[PDB]
Scaffold this active site. Structure first.
Site, mmCIF file in Angstrom:
data_model
loop_
_atom_site.group_PDB
_atom_site.id
_atom_site.type_symbol
_atom_site.label_atom_id
_atom_site.label_comp_id
_atom_site.label_asym_id
_atom_site.label_seq_id
_atom_site.Cartn_x
_atom_site.Cartn_y
_atom_site.Cartn_z
ATOM 1 N N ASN A 146 0.798 -1.233 0.000
ATOM 2 C CA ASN A 146 0.000 0.000 0.000
ATOM 3 C C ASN A 146 0.838 1.296 0.000
ATOM 4 O O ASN A 146 1.784 1.447 0.793
ATOM 5 C CB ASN A 146 -1.023 -0.033 1.159
ATOM 6 C CG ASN A 146 -1.365 1.349 1.694
ATOM 7 O OD1 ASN A 146 -2.386 1.944 1.323
ATOM 8 N ND2 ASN A 146 -0.505 1.869 2.570
ATOM 9 N N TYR A 150 1.022 11.277 3.000
ATOM 10 C CA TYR A 150 0.581 11.874 4.260
ATOM 11 C C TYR A 150 1.533 13.027 4.564
ATOM 12 O O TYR A 150 2.627 13.073 4.015
ATOM 13 C CB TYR A 150 0.553 10.824 5.380
ATOM 14 C CG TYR A 150 -0.033 9.484 4.946
ATOM 15 C CD1 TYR A 150 -1.335 9.393 4.441
ATOM 16 C CD2 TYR A 150 0.707 8.309 5.045
ATOM 17 C CE1 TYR A 150 -1.879 8.174 4.042
ATOM 18 C CE2 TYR A 150 0.169 7.084 4.646
ATOM 19 C CZ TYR A 150 -1.123 7.024 4.146
ATOM 20 O OH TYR A 150 -1.665 5.819 3.748
ATOM 21 N N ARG A 163 0.758 11.310 9.759
ATOM 22 C CA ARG A 163 -0.567 11.897 9.737
ATOM 23 C C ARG A 163 -1.493 11.066 8.846
ATOM 24 O O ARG A 163 -2.073 11.592 7.891
ATOM 25 C CB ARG A 163 -0.478 13.338 9.209
ATOM 26 C CG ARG A 163 -1.421 14.340 9.871
ATOM 27 C CD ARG A 163 -2.765 14.537 9.166
ATOM 28 N NE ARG A 163 -3.633 15.438 9.933
ATOM 29 C CZ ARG A 163 -4.558 16.241 9.412
ATOM 30 N NH1 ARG A 163 -4.765 16.283 8.104
ATOM 31 N NH2 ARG A 163 -5.269 17.025 10.210
ATOM 32 N N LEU A 165 -4.927 8.760 8.045
ATOM 33 C CA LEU A 165 -6.309 9.007 8.365
ATOM 34 C C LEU A 165 -7.036 7.660 8.423
ATOM 35 O O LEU A 165 -7.380 7.079 7.395
ATOM 36 C CB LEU A 165 -6.897 10.025 7.360
ATOM 37 C CG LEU A 165 -5.959 11.184 6.907
ATOM 38 C CD1 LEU A 165 -6.371 11.761 5.561
ATOM 39 C CD2 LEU A 165 -5.795 12.302 7.937
ATOM 40 N N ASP A 261 -4.873 24.231 6.012
ATOM 41 C CA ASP A 261 -5.326 23.180 5.113
ATOM 42 C C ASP A 261 -5.691 23.774 3.750
ATOM 43 O O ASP A 261 -5.906 24.975 3.641
ATOM 44 C CB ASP A 261 -6.511 22.426 5.734
ATOM 45 C CG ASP A 261 -6.594 20.957 5.288
ATOM 46 O OD1 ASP A 261 -6.093 20.627 4.191
ATOM 47 O OD2 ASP A 261 -7.180 20.128 6.029
#
Lengths: 461, 461
Positions: A146, A150, A163, A165, A261
């Site tokens: 995978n 991040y 980080r 999710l 963000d």
């Protein structure tokens, strides 16, 4: 095309790469410039002069649509469609060693991350932020791998934050690693500055049947040159510039942020796991691929508009009435959507809303959906705003749904992670829907539109 | 298994076919019996004695779930799942002549349809109704063919009604035939009493990439034995018992009905095209396959519950959280739906509703959706009713959506073909959704449940 530097040179040739020789600060400055460039639309930027540094800092790489398509094989942003014909139809690797990626290894206490020019992006961010690492992880149970991007806030000398999710198969990898082998360290490897092919496979959803080295590398013409890492038995791409190898100490976490963000706001401090790097393995004139996000546009935001041309076919297969679909960057690349349809019966626009809100997991958080007939250009506010204001009775025509899944971070929703959505039926109303005679919209002759194209240049204005 | 009579014999062996030698009326009587049988659950019924007639009248063929699965290749109603693994993964013919289907041809004025024992189904129906013809049609433009079951009210000596419903690719076939060759007759062929394999392919949605002789026949172990018709160059299945050949006279139509619908009500008279039959081609001891519909249950209604076990996988692929999905026959096989899920986050049950209402075109008309956790049996009212009444605040928990597509025939909706829907979120409410401590549901030990199964017979009650 081959490995990242091979792709790099193509751009510089056609005036799509730019060479900045001037002293530029990783702290906020390189960010500021890339925004000026992207907001007006300059090329990608390479920085052979970071202030107080000597490693090149590459940003704004996919900063406009055309940089993406050439990065996929073509010139026309029209065969991005064909990238999407691919993922719905599906409903392979090649290992090296002394491969360019690991020519220079620094392990143990020699690991000092202050050696790299990580970007400090906006005003009251926390520490500098590693924004473009392609994280690799393995499930302990199976073997299939995978990838994920991040944001990696450096807190300590060789400490980094993951980080991730919760949902991400990448996070789920760590969770099942603590579960089967408890109190035991979780190996991770994050590869930096990679080739175009796996990089656009890293910002993409694939069905769990095919690995994302096999899809990603076969967006190039060549199967993926990969490699075993020095400190673990998981794979990083070989075409890499810097590769990070470490593990996460179980239970150990740090306070993360504030960060701005792509939402245009400051995320408030909340804690996340600490990926401790035992090895930083690189090339020589090795590069470090980077970006940033903020009050939209930004690179991901264009990358977003890029990505969604890929989704359209997937949506179209399932929803043949959909002429066109598009999420504006003004709306955080994902929060608002305009869809345009060949309307086939009263009620139709609602089948579309609920479709949009449910079919793709990406579009499950989309607060606003606006549906219009195929004589409205989705990509133009002139059309959409006209659409809304000539073709709807607001109270009659607005679907309001409550208590639906919404972002954990969207502070406008009444509770955390649970808010409401709004559909806007701006389709012409057939009878059943209205009891009034509707208006006959002025429509332009495609002929007249065609003849005036052949003439547009040789009219110079 | 082979052709219809070959399948027929298998049932009679295992007590799944029944032989009625007594004089039975096609007018309403044969209907009444099949309902008694289906409502309690007898076998299929063959009628070697229609009153005033001599052609056998076969009904209630797929009248319970098990009659379907054996008709597909297996014994377990569990591999109906596998029929559905098939249609989502996909995201071949064999011609005869003196083939059994056309051994006896009656053309021209010799065509008298009063020769066949068409069922007169309920109290104030119009004329007798041909309920089980498998209509074949060709598009003038391409070559690829279309099957469909429409109800065929005999009005005249050799005149029949095509009750097709505008949307159907079958109807769209006729519409494009008048368009390209105007004022020119439209050839149709409707084949009666066929083999199990194409018959279950006739009550099924296939992507337009594969013909429905190729899917249907490869539900059997043998590629489809087909044939050219005598009066036209379109194909009917060869395993047939009676084949109808004619054309529709352009512009010519008759008043249709009243008829009772599987809705439990009388459809009011509305007009439809007249398929005029020039040939009735048959075997000898030829049969005529038939059914009926009314206030549910009925054959289609079971056929419906049959069909939907096929949909579940398709839905599950797209919606992994869906443990189970089911539309009751009490609710007209399509109007109400219970879904059960592994809930993954607040808001979740709404993503499911909108999914159900939009993903599959079959489920676009479903007024009521009730979503519950995987500890509720969808198929049991005890569970669902408990679900609703312990786990929801009605006003808080009910999604009401207005102005959505609904049946043109559903007389409860405020206007024709445009009505509202209702979702019911009967999932346990995670925080965000409720601010109260929720109840801990009693859950049964699977062990205790397992041990008591081994014991159930050898406990006789």
């Amino acid at each position: 095309y081959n490995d990242l530097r091979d792709f790099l040179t193509l751009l510089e040739q056609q005036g799509e790469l730019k060479r900045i020789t001037l002293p530029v600060d990783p702290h906020l400055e390189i960010t500021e410039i890339a925004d000026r460039t992207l907001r007006a639309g300059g090329p990608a930027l390479l920085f052979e002069n970071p202030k107080g540094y000597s490693m090149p800092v590459l940003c704004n790489l996919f900063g406009t649509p055309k940089r993406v398509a050439m990065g996929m094989g073509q010139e026309d942003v029209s065969a991005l469609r064909e990238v999407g014909k691919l993922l719905a139809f599906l409903k392979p690797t090649k290992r090296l060693r002394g491969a360019p990626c690991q020519q220079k290894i620094v392990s143990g206490d020699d690991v000092d991350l202050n050696r790299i020019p990580i970007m400090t992006c906006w005003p009251e961010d926390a520490a500098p932020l590693i924004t473009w690492g392609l994280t690799v992880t393995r499930g302990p149970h199976k073997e299939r791998q995978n990838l994920g991007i991040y944001r990696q806030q450096l807190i300590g000398k060789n400490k980094l934050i993951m980080r991730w999710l919760s949902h991400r198969g990448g996070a789920l990898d760590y969770q099942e690693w603590c579960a089967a082998h408890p109190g035991e360290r979780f190996p991770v490897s994050v590869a930096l500055g990679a080739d175009p092919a796996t990089i656009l496979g890293a910002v993409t959803p694939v069905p769990d049947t095919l690995s994302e080295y096999a899809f990603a590398g076969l967006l190039r013409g060549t199967k993926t040159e990969v490699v075993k890492c020095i400190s673990n038995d998981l794979e990083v791409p070989a075409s890499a510039e810097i590769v990070l190898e470490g593990y996460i100490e179980q239970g150990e976490t740090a306070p993360e942020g504030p960060y701005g963000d792509h939402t245009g706001y400051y995320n408030e401090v909340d804690s996340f796991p600490v990926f401790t790097v035992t090895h930083i393995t690189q090339r020589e004139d090795a590069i470090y691929h980077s970006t940033y996000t903020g009050r939209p546009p930004d690179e991901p935001a264009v990358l977003g508009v890029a990505l969604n041309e890929v989704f359209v076919p997937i949506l179209q297969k399932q929803f043949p009435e959909i002429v066109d679909f598009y999420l504006p960057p003004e709306g955080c690349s994902y929060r608002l959507a305009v869809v345009t349809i060949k309307k086939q019966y009263a009620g139709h626009a609602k089948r579309v809303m609920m479709g949009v809100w449910s079919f793709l997991r990406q579009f499950m958080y989309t607060k606003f959906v606006i549906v219009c007939d195929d004589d409205v250009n989705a990509r133009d506010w002139n059309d959409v705003i006209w659409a809304i204001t000539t073709r709807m009775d607001p109270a009659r025509d607005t679907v309001l749904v409550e208590n639906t899944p919404i972002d954990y971070l969207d502070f406008a929703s009444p509770v955390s992670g649970l808010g409401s959505k709004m559909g806007l039926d701006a389709t012409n109303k057939w009878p059943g829907e209205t009891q009034r005679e509707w208006g006959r919209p002025i429509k332009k002759d495609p002929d007249v539109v065609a003849h005036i194209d052949a003439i547009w240049d040789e009219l110079a204005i």
